[PDB]
Write a protein that binds this ligand. Structure first.
Ligand SMILES: Cc1c(CO)cnn1-c1ccc(F)cc1
Length: 209
């Protein structure tokens, strides 16, 4: 059972602007996603200080980067606090309405796409390199859910029947045909060392066959 939703008009406007605008510094998507994972790990660590039982779904706090050349996917896994169904559908989009408005006024004022994180909508930088994005997430107070969007004004949400995750978020980037450079180990190492060197959680870079 798959539910289809329409993005808010401002979010769809931001996505199409990210997909259509000519901009070569595409590597900044990895900094935003890792930064998002770092915030989710911070939130579950703080909540667990006043409630140790919130770590019963997993004690490890880490981030994993997993490239797959066969499927042409780049996956960012974190064991953070995760997102509920309400987050995926209306909560995160309501917050992002003001950040999108402010971000686009700055763009016409002289700003560039690389400061998208300062407006809280850095997740959508994934569509600099992805034709489709899948998000598997599991929050302590909800079930596991699968979010997916190929832009175009709509996204879907369903109950995930895959491998149970325990707790956290998994972002699967289905890369455009000409962006396969972000599957190479030496390229991912280079971006992480340049933009995410001081993240306070272990970042493990998987390798392939
Ligand atoms: C938005 C996002 C992603 C996707 O980049 C992964 N974890 N999170 C996240 C989830 C919950 C948070 F409180 C903060 C960040």
């Amino acid at each position: 059972e798959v539910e289809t939703f329409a993005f808010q008009a401002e979010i769809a406007q931001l996505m199409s602007l990210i997909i259509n605008t000519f901009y070569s510094n595409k590597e900044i998507f990895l900094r935003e996603l890792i930064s998002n994972s770092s915030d989710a790990l911070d939130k579950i660590r703080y909540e667990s200080l006043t409630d140790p039982s919130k770590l019963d779904s997993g004690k490890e706090l880490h981030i994993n980067l997993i490239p797959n050349k066969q499927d042409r996917t780049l996956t960012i896994v974190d064991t953070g606090i995760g997102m509920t169904k309400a987050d995926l559908i209306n909560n995160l989009g309501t917050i992002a309405k003001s950040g999108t408005k402010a971000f686009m006024e700055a763009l016409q004022a002289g700003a560039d796409i690389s400061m998208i994180g300062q407006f809280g909508v850095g997740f959508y930088s994934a569509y600099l390199v992805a034709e489709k994005v899948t998000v598997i997430t599991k929050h302590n107070d909800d079930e596991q859910y699968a979010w997916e969007s190929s832009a175009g004004g709509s996204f879907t949400v369903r109950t995930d029947t895959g491998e149970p995750m325990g707790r956290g978020t998994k972002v699967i980037l289905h890369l455009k045909e000409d962006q396969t450079e972000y599957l190479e180990e030496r390229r991912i190492k280079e971006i992480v060392k340049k933009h995410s060197q001081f993240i306070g959680y272990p970042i493990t870079l998987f390798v392939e066959k």
